Amino acid sequence: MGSMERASLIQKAKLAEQAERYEDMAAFMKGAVEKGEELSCEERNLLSVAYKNVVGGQRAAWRVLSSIEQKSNEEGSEEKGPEVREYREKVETELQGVCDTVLGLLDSHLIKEAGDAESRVFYLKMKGDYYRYLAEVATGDDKKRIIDSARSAYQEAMDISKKEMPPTNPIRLGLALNFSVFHYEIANSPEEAISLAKTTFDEAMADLHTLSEDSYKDSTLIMQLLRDNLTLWT
């Protein structure tokens, strides 16, 4: 993408979103990042949407194959060869490559050039998310360091967002939702997850009165995700 203009890459990423071609969208946004300039709010959201749909497809595939593999590893299952394991490993390697790509973009050099609280919290939330995606498939030795990388990114984002953003900010709400999911699914801390979700919901509820109608809609939509997770876990 080094020969295409930055504006053209953004425009084509938008076209790809409209056509539901998220691999193309991700490659376009990667080229845009590689142009070296800081991203706007809209461009950050495009990058996140693109890589989120790519990894989402790969993670769903991984879960399907992992469940097939673990049923093939039960008592009474007929030996089928190494095919399921090999294909699960291939999908896993591809997922890991996508996460490594995102984290390399964040490290060179999105995070270190983000001074504003909104952009920095956004990038650290992404970092925590993609280390969490790596942690979902990790099995040995580096597992604990991957988990702590996710925890560290999430924690720094939480600190900055508590200091510099209102409790109704959608980025803060989504960050708290994802950090609670990390606590529940990854860190084996369901009480921390529930506590975080209820505290975030309540403090945003208390400040809903300051918001305009559209900001109100934006914040309540994510508070509903928090309430969904709470209803599932309680």
Binding site: D129, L173, G174, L177, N178, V181, Y184, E185, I222, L225, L226, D228, N229, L232, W233
Partner: peptide, 5 residues
């Protein structure tokens, strides 16, 4: 399935 963002 639990919600994430």
């Amino acid at each position: 399935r639990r919600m994430s963002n």
